[PDB]
């Protein structure tokens, strides 16, 4: 994998992961197996987690998690890049530290007033409770992207992955890199993630879809996508095919749609046909992002779709057995 | 009559800069009609050109503020309405203050120290419009402004408090605070399904406020997204409206009314486990105006049919004008 061969752009959050007890959950009125927005009552909780010794800080956010998992899976130094917005605070410096530890070349845009986005990941057994404060992650501006030191990361990249959620934060950055990729034989990849469905988002998504070589999604996202645009089918295999056959921009040959269904098989539409892949488990939160990261690693290495899906399932199965989107030193995938 | 500050709205205010444009202007800035675009910064040459037009207008906009202004126009009683939201410390913030005062709305804006005021270029040709929005300060509202005694007095004064669902992306603490206050003090709290949430973070915030909503407004597309997101297999808008009205209720709330519009098709209203449907009556961004007309009659203690008819009247007036504007006085009975 060449230097900066894969780039991601998104909404970075510093994940503050810690194994907690009943007293902590009751104190901040947080229930397990649910992701809530941080309120004024939850803001001092980030200080309490920071004050603990066994705390793990991770350069998170869905896209950044995928880029880190791709980097871990590739094991080649300098193969990945990432751009997103952070604040000028200690949590921003921790995000810079962890991105460097994960081997990702991160060029963050520093907002002058917004604190860095954070996410408390409270762990008990195999259960999590996410409390997110997006804050600076929503302030990315295309002026950062257009600077020569940051545009060099787009120029270096052969694969550029940006989540659909970023269409609400910086649609000018997505359209700029998507149009650049079509004009310069690069692969543009996106997902069906969205905070909400509004006219502004609908129109921005419609403008980028022709430029997407790959579209990733989960069954719920695919079914919302199909219903929003009037497709009457609820079959995920047919929805994946219809996504792959959306209109194509000039300079884009084909589109591949990859739809995950949790325990049920991964659905892949390509060349007017749908192939389905059963999930293979390892002996005995962040799983979707890890799946995309494993898929991207093999895509970068020019491998086939079955290797891409198997690597995605491997990475997803590793990450689910660890607190947060974390992993061991080296992978063991073939 | 309507008492002082009887109706309050909280939201994301934008100064709408409206003007009739021509083909040359649309081509110049590569703008498509019947399209909503989010701009990261103000396209300064376009804003100056729009300002230099003959029929230009500066309106204190944003979906909720539009509803509050339409309700104030419909009521015609000075001081009956209030509004809170975030603006910047600039000329557009002062124009926003000027237009809110001209519309007769008591606006207590939170002034962000660095973010410019949110703006929206409204480019109108015929019966079509194109919107280019730079939200900027509108997304920086903080509950510290709400909790100040001079601003909390507007909550205390109000009998009806209306907030869009989208405002949960800006200040969920303000929404939850006023929604919980309304349930404890016999006030009516109203919301809409605008920007239906798909993300788990936003879904959990909405789930926490829905038990406090006495009224939920929505359109057919929003209602169908809401139903699909939470696993309801029905696609019938009449049944979806009934299921919304029957969502769990918080302590101190006896019933919920769900109002779903369907464009040309009738207004659907669910109440007391039954669904009543109202054909649209015609005159010889209409949704905000519909809500404003409905709110005006609700403030006057009128029945649901009057509320729906006033909503249709206001919506039919606003569609025949550039942006969410109206004549001096209403003619509704």
Residue numbers in the entry:
A (entry chain A): 3 to 286, 293 to 342
B (entry chain B): 2 to 285, 294 to 342
Give the authors' words:
Adenosine undergoes ATP-dependent phosphorylation catalyzed by adenosine kinase (ADK). In plants, ADK also phosphorylates cytokinin ribosides, transport forms of the hormone. We discovered that maize and moss enzymes can form dimers upon increasing protein concentration, setting them apart from the monomeric human and protozoal ADKs. Structural and kinetic analyses revealed a catalytically inactive unique dimer.
Of the two selected representatives, ZmADK2 and PpADK1, we only obtained crystals of the apo form of ZmADK2. Crystallization conditions of ZmADK2 favored the dimeric form to be present in the asymmetric unit, which contains two ZmADK2 molecules, each in the open conformation, and resembles that of HsADK, with an average root mean square deviation (RMSD) of ~1.2 Å and 1.4 Å for all Cα atoms. Each monomer is composed of two domains: a large 10-stranded α/β Rossmann-like nucleotide-binding domain (residues 1–14, 64–117, and 137–340) comprising the ATP-binding site; and a small five-stranded α/β domain (residues 17–61 and 120–134). The small domain encompases β2, β3, β4, β8, and β9 sheets, plus α1 and α2 helices. Both domains are connected via four peptide hinges (Leu15–Leu16, Gly62–Gly63, Thr118–Gly119, and Asn135–Leu136). The existence of the dimer was further confirmed by X-ray crystallography on ZmADK2, and the structure explains why this oligomeric state is not functional. So far, such a dimer arrangement has not been reported for any other ADK. Remarkably, the dimer interface prevents displacement of the small domains. We further showed that the ADK dimer can exist only when both subunits are in an open conformation, as observed in the ZmADK2 structure. When in a dimeric state, the enzyme cannot be catalytically active as the rotation of the small domain and closure of the substrate cavity for catalysis is blocked. Therefore, to be active, moss and maize ADK dimers must be dissociated into monomers.
